[PDB]
Amino acid sequence: AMSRSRPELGDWSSPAELAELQRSQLPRVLAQALRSPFYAARYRGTTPPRTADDFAGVEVTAKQDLRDQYPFGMLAVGREHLATYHESSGTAGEPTASYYTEEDWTDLAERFARKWTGIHPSDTFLVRTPYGLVITGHLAQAAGRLRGATVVPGDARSLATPLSRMVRVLKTLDVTLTWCNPTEITMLAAAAKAAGLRPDQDFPHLRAMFTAAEPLTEVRRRRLSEIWGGIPVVEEYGSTETGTIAGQCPEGRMHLWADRAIFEVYDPRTGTLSEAGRGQMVVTPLYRDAMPLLRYNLADDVEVSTDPCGCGWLLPTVTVLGRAGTGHRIGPATVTQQRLEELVFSLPAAYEVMFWRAKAHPDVLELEFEAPEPVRQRAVKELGAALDRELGVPHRITGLAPGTLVPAEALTAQRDILKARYLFAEDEDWDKAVMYF
Amino acid sequence: RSRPELGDWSSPAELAELQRSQLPRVLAQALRSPFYAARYRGTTPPRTADDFAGVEVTAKQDLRDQYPFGMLAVGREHLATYHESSGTAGEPTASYYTEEDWTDLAERFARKWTGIHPSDTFLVRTPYGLVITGHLAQAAGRLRGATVVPGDARSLATPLSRMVRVLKTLDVTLTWCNPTEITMLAAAAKAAGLRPDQDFPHLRAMFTAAEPLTEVRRRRLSEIWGGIPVVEEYGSTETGTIAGQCPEGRMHLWADRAIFEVYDPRTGTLSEAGRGQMVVTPLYRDAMPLLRYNLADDVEVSTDPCGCGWLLPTVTVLGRAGTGHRIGPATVTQQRLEELVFSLPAAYEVMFWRAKAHPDVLELEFEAPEPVRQRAVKELGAALDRELGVPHRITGLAPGTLVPAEALTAQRDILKARYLFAEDEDWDKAVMYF
Ligand SMILES: Nc1ncnc2c1ncn2[C@@H]1O[C@H](COP(=O)(O)OP(=O)(O)NP(=O)(O)O)[C@@H](O)[C@H]1O
Ligand SMILES: Nc1ncnc2c1ncn2[C@@H]1O[C@H](COP(=O)(O)OP(=O)(O)NP(=O)(O)O)[C@@H](O)[C@H]1O
Ligand SMILES: [Mg+2]
Ligand SMILES: [Mg+2]
Ligand SMILES: [Zn+2]
Ligand SMILES: [Zn+2]
């Protein structure tokens, strides 16, 4: 393919060459951004940025800007050129719209498809994320179609596809790849066990699990891998409005797809943008026509490093800590979900602790988790000792019976996919007449 | 491959030839599947157009028995997508498609007499979970360049309140949802402060399927949404779209893409027209060949020419709504009741109802706002007296009884798993965040 117009891993031999692949797109990107009502209004009465050098002066685009411009204030092409329209997860009251041409979709699908394990025609790919307005289900399906994998559209949060039916599909279709968030990986494992199947042995064709959408510690990621037989759990970082911006290498670090976007770290205190360090993730996608974004702040706290990785990819690594501002403090001690997660998932695998939750009170950390009765007291004691050793916070830890946080019906209930029925026989329950879901 | 378009045939004889010329390929493809290889093991299988007249019907129970890949005629490497049918979960029905199979599927859906255009914004409000329906409409929208808004259905992510907001704010021009969902969206619109007959000026057509739909109900759904076309099609997960509405309001069989026959289940005879069970042999599919697949829907196929000038037979689908219940001296079909319910004046706003056939009496409930309820009860009773003569027990209910207010107004944030909460936060959304 002498013919392909977007860069691939291996097209650049140095960071200087990568920087050139980026800057050579900025005149097109800056001209396209100005066609949107939002950027045309932003630079009204001034000379707009046109050149690679002008980009250093470009003002950040905030989430609140995208919400204020709902639905099509960020639109730079005729609506006739849109292929799909999406809205972000989170608050329903203040939606964020994103939208993509067919050519925009090719870039999106390529970035998702950068899975170090490969996606092949030989694969059966269960897409277990939502298709309702959000991009995630559509994105995985598009990458599956691109690479010829058989796509099984599992959807998520749909009454049509409960966990019991997904477990049966995983086993009976010999599914080789999955796409779902890390909590859904443990939900599927709990559903398998409730169906009398061992996730570590009874799914021999499952070769990788693709995941995103949650901050994921290496301790949790490795436990999720071990639960499913030691297979790779392949993380990516993305959003509805950016698509996939980073993907895992074989060493287990996420690398920024810097050939497809200019990535900057925003220090909200000084207002400076830097190519690496700690701060808020800023993205300028290079290969989109419909919805240009100039220095869009995802407002995730990230650590970007240019330090080499054992994978040898010539791309910076990124750790995603969480959403900016989300931390809690109890003693002098900062309590992060990420620190608690590392302690919970360091309990021996034999204790089967997967489901937990915690509440920061001013004085004390309240934490609950499900564990089988025989190991429950051990789990409470060891997790307490871990909190003492690592954080020194006062705690109130309660072990719960399985079925308490995650009900049995979520794991085992089957649901017929009915249609509206208006006339029933005497013996039939007519309660499913109009509300048939 | 080269697939026919409306207008490629000038007569029924030419249509019959477009079909028969595909049958050698279709019969050889079917034989590659374990199911048809086993069916014709130790015989000479059918090879020619003439041999097709002798081909045994394929039943739904065959597709269930062959779960998952007994109907598969290509290497799995060539599959693009895998689907399972709606209905019983305990006994799944698998279907699957190559990329080229998908082009035929998308083309058949896209035969919408109103057109699908790049100028369109197309809300897909059917499920994407395993079933084909959401994927099919999305594929046809992508094929014709319409902006696809993936609404999904039966998803906690996309309640009615949010779909009504999307209809209005995105100037949606086309919808895809079942006929019950058309009335659910109308009730949700009023609950959002929007009049379905006036406040959606860019909505130009509503595409629908999946339910038996009387012309009386279809015309009422049109009137509720300001007199815009309600464009019906007939399909299934295992066949795709097999008939679509013409501008005269009849569904025409897509006979250029499939051989349609009417099955008498008592004699087992197959006829090109008349009353009986819908039998389909798709002509342009490689992955999952079907020879005379019996959808087991009760249909009436007619060869009578239509004012639309399409040279294709028309089909009415009675289905499960065609099957009588004896009550009084009389026999009552869902389709006959539906015609009487939707013959009540539009201004009574009767959209949601249900009925139970007892041996002695028809029990029927419907929502009607105060103060038209007792008029509606009386007129519907008189209609049942005049038309059916069945004893009835009719109850008018307050709106919010059959279709709860919560279904129409509830908004739901799309949350992710959260493990650490502040004191004042509800931590019940920790692991069960849907
Ligand atoms: N691998 C990851 N690690 C950590 N956080 C992640 C990861 N992937 C996604 N996220 C988080 O999820 C966000 C994107 O959520 P997603 O639903 O995929 O898009 P969205 O529709 O923009 N939702 P939202 O921003 O939450 O309103 C990112 O900004 C991060 O906060
Ligand atoms: N226009 C229509 N009029 C009447 N019935 C229809 C119409 N369209 C679809 N149907 C019914 O819906 C069935 C197909 O349901 P659908 O969910 O679209 O496919 P499926 O998931 O394959 N279901 P099934 O094969 O019956 O188990 C048809 O066989 C008919 O019974
Ligand atoms: Mg368009
Ligand atoms: Mg394949
Ligand atoms: Zn690496
Ligand atoms: Zn016609």
Short mmCIF file of N, CA and C in Angstrom, two decimals, chain B residues 187-251:
data_model
loop_
_atom_site.label_atom_id
_atom_site.label_comp_id
_atom_site.label_asym_id
_atom_site.label_seq_id
_atom_site.Cartn_x
_atom_site.Cartn_y
_atom_site.Cartn_z
N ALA B 187 -46.32 9.51 22.72
CA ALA B 187 -46.73 9.75 24.12
C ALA B 187 -45.56 10.45 24.85
N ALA B 188 -44.33 10.04 24.57
CA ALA B 188 -43.11 10.64 25.17
C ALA B 188 -42.96 12.08 24.69
N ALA B 189 -43.27 12.37 23.42
CA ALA B 189 -43.19 13.73 22.86
C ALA B 189 -44.13 14.64 23.65
N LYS B 190 -45.37 14.23 23.86
CA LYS B 190 -46.33 15.09 24.61
C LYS B 190 -45.80 15.33 26.02
N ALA B 191 -45.27 14.29 26.67
CA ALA B 191 -44.67 14.41 28.02
C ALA B 191 -43.44 15.34 28.02
N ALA B 192 -42.78 15.55 26.89
CA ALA B 192 -41.64 16.48 26.75
C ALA B 192 -42.14 17.86 26.32
N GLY B 193 -43.45 18.06 26.19
CA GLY B 193 -44.00 19.37 25.82
C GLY B 193 -43.98 19.57 24.31
N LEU B 194 -43.98 18.50 23.51
CA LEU B 194 -43.89 18.60 22.02
C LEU B 194 -45.12 17.93 21.42
N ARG B 195 -45.76 18.59 20.46
CA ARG B 195 -46.95 18.05 19.75
C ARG B 195 -46.47 17.25 18.55
N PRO B 196 -46.65 15.92 18.53
CA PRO B 196 -46.21 15.11 17.40
C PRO B 196 -46.79 15.54 16.05
N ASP B 197 -47.99 16.15 16.03
CA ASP B 197 -48.65 16.55 14.76
C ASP B 197 -48.08 17.87 14.20
N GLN B 198 -47.24 18.61 14.92
CA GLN B 198 -46.81 19.97 14.50
C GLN B 198 -45.33 20.27 14.78
N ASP B 199 -44.76 19.77 15.88
CA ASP B 199 -43.48 20.30 16.43
C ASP B 199 -42.25 19.58 15.87
N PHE B 200 -42.42 18.68 14.89
CA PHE B 200 -41.32 17.94 14.22
C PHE B 200 -41.43 18.20 12.72
N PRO B 201 -41.28 19.46 12.27
CA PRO B 201 -41.51 19.82 10.86
C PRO B 201 -40.56 19.15 9.86
N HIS B 202 -39.37 18.71 10.29
CA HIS B 202 -38.37 18.05 9.41
C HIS B 202 -38.61 16.55 9.32
N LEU B 203 -39.43 15.97 10.21
CA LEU B 203 -39.74 14.51 10.16
C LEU B 203 -40.61 14.27 8.92
N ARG B 204 -40.12 13.50 7.94
CA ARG B 204 -40.81 13.37 6.63
C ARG B 204 -41.33 11.95 6.41
N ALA B 205 -40.80 10.94 7.11
CA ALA B 205 -41.28 9.56 7.01
C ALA B 205 -40.87 8.75 8.24
N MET B 206 -41.69 7.76 8.55
CA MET B 206 -41.44 6.80 9.64
C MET B 206 -41.47 5.39 9.06
N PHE B 207 -40.33 4.70 9.12
CA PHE B 207 -40.17 3.31 8.62
C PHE B 207 -40.50 2.36 9.76
N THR B 208 -41.21 1.27 9.47
CA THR B 208 -41.70 0.37 10.54
C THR B 208 -41.81 -1.07 10.02
N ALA B 209 -41.77 -2.02 10.94
CA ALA B 209 -41.87 -3.47 10.69
C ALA B 209 -42.07 -4.17 12.03
N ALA B 210 -42.02 -5.50 12.01
CA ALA B 210 -41.81 -6.40 13.17
C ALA B 210 -43.16 -6.73 13.83
N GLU B 211 -44.25 -6.03 13.48
CA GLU B 211 -45.61 -6.29 14.01
C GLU B 211 -46.60 -6.36 12.86
N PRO B 212 -47.62 -7.23 12.97
CA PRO B 212 -48.79 -7.15 12.09
C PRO B 212 -49.43 -5.76 12.25
N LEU B 213 -49.68 -5.09 11.14
CA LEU B 213 -50.08 -3.67 11.14
C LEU B 213 -51.25 -3.49 10.19
N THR B 214 -52.44 -3.21 10.71
CA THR B 214 -53.65 -2.94 9.90
C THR B 214 -53.48 -1.58 9.24
N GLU B 215 -54.16 -1.37 8.11
CA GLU B 215 -54.11 -0.07 7.41
C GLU B 215 -54.74 0.99 8.32
N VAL B 216 -55.75 0.62 9.11
CA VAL B 216 -56.46 1.58 10.01
C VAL B 216 -55.45 2.10 11.05
N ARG B 217 -54.71 1.21 11.70
CA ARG B 217 -53.67 1.61 12.68
C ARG B 217 -52.56 2.42 11.97
N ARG B 218 -52.07 1.93 10.83
CA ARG B 218 -50.98 2.61 10.10
C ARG B 218 -51.40 4.06 9.79
N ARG B 219 -52.63 4.25 9.30
CA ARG B 219 -53.17 5.60 8.98
C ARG B 219 -53.26 6.43 10.27
N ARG B 220 -53.69 5.85 11.38
CA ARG B 220 -53.72 6.60 12.67
C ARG B 220 -52.29 7.00 13.09
N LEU B 221 -51.29 6.13 12.98
CA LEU B 221 -49.89 6.48 13.35
C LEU B 221 -49.43 7.65 12.48
N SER B 222 -49.76 7.63 11.18
CA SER B 222 -49.48 8.76 10.27
C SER B 222 -50.12 10.05 10.81
N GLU B 223 -51.41 10.00 11.14
CA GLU B 223 -52.18 11.18 11.59
C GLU B 223 -51.61 11.70 12.92
N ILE B 224 -51.21 10.81 13.82
CA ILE B 224 -50.62 11.25 15.12
C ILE B 224 -49.39 12.12 14.82
N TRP B 225 -48.56 11.73 13.85
CA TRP B 225 -47.31 12.46 13.49
C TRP B 225 -47.52 13.47 12.34
N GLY B 226 -48.72 14.03 12.18
CA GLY B 226 -48.96 15.15 11.25
C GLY B 226 -49.23 14.73 9.81
N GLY B 227 -49.61 13.47 9.56
CA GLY B 227 -50.02 12.99 8.23
C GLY B 227 -48.82 12.58 7.38
N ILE B 228 -47.65 12.37 7.96
CA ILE B 228 -46.45 11.92 7.20
C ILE B 228 -46.55 10.43 6.91
N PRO B 229 -45.90 9.93 5.83
CA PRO B 229 -45.93 8.52 5.50
C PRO B 229 -45.34 7.61 6.59
N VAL B 230 -46.06 6.52 6.87
CA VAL B 230 -45.55 5.39 7.68
C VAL B 230 -45.28 4.25 6.70
N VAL B 231 -44.00 3.95 6.50
CA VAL B 231 -43.52 3.08 5.41
C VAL B 231 -43.16 1.73 6.02
N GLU B 232 -44.01 0.74 5.75
CA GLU B 232 -43.90 -0.62 6.31
C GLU B 232 -42.94 -1.47 5.49
N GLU B 233 -42.22 -2.36 6.15
CA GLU B 233 -41.55 -3.50 5.49
C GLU B 233 -41.81 -4.77 6.30
N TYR B 234 -41.53 -5.91 5.68
CA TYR B 234 -41.70 -7.27 6.24
C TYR B 234 -40.35 -7.97 6.10
N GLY B 235 -39.84 -8.51 7.21
CA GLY B 235 -38.51 -9.13 7.28
C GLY B 235 -38.36 -10.03 8.48
N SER B 236 -37.16 -10.58 8.64
CA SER B 236 -36.75 -11.42 9.79
C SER B 236 -35.22 -11.38 9.86
N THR B 237 -34.64 -11.72 11.02
CA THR B 237 -33.17 -11.78 11.22
C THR B 237 -32.55 -12.77 10.21
N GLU B 238 -33.24 -13.86 9.91
CA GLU B 238 -32.64 -14.95 9.10
C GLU B 238 -32.80 -14.67 7.60
N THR B 239 -33.70 -13.76 7.18
CA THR B 239 -34.00 -13.49 5.74
C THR B 239 -33.62 -12.07 5.31
N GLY B 240 -33.53 -11.15 6.25
CA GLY B 240 -33.59 -9.70 6.00
C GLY B 240 -34.95 -9.29 5.46
N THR B 241 -35.01 -8.11 4.84
CA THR B 241 -36.24 -7.47 4.32
C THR B 241 -36.71 -8.23 3.09
N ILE B 242 -37.93 -8.75 3.11
CA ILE B 242 -38.44 -9.55 1.97
C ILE B 242 -39.59 -8.83 1.27
N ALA B 243 -40.16 -7.78 1.85
CA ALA B 243 -41.18 -6.96 1.19
C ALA B 243 -41.12 -5.53 1.72
N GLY B 244 -41.46 -4.57 0.88
CA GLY B 244 -41.52 -3.14 1.24
C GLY B 244 -42.73 -2.47 0.63
N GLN B 245 -43.24 -1.44 1.30
CA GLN B 245 -44.41 -0.64 0.89
C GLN B 245 -44.11 0.10 -0.42
N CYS B 246 -45.09 0.19 -1.31
CA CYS B 246 -45.10 1.11 -2.48
C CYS B 246 -45.87 2.37 -2.09
N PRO B 247 -45.85 3.44 -2.92
CA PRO B 247 -46.59 4.66 -2.59
C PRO B 247 -48.11 4.47 -2.44
N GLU B 248 -48.68 3.37 -2.95
CA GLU B 248 -50.13 3.05 -2.83
C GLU B 248 -50.42 2.34 -1.50
N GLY B 249 -49.42 2.00 -0.69
CA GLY B 249 -49.59 1.51 0.68
C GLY B 249 -49.65 -0.01 0.76
N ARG B 250 -49.35 -0.72 -0.32
CA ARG B 250 -49.22 -2.20 -0.33
C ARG B 250 -47.73 -2.59 -0.21
N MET B 251 -47.45 -3.69 0.50
CA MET B 251 -46.09 -4.26 0.57
C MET B 251 -45.89 -5.17 -0.64
#
